[PDB]
């Protein structure tokens, strides 16, 4: 109620730092993937 609120604000803000970081990544990871996927088969891993 006193000390916990001090450290919670730091972890909550750092969670927002990666939130804006993934917000631009979510737009890139979905757009960079080509929707018309082509059928393929991997011969050797």
């Amino acid at each position: 109620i006193r000390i916990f609120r001090s450290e919670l604000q730091r972890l909550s803000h750092e969670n927002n730092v990666m939130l804006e970081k993934i917000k631009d990544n979510k737009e890139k990871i979905k757009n960079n993937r080509q929707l018309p996927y082509l059928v393929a088969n991997v011969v050797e891993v």
Binding site: Q34, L35, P36, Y37, L38, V39
Partner: protein, 59 residues
Amino acid sequence: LKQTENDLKDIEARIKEKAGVKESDTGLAHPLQVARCTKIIKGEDAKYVINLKQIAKFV
């Protein structure tokens, strides 16, 4: 009748060749014996993107 159908390439066929070819060939692409599409992104629902040629088959 002979001279009437000669100049239709500059008048009537300009619209016919645009709607019957340019629209069908848009993006490296009514009885249908052939269909082709290249890199079409449409949001699962009406996706299609099917190449009838044996090369580069799609699902």
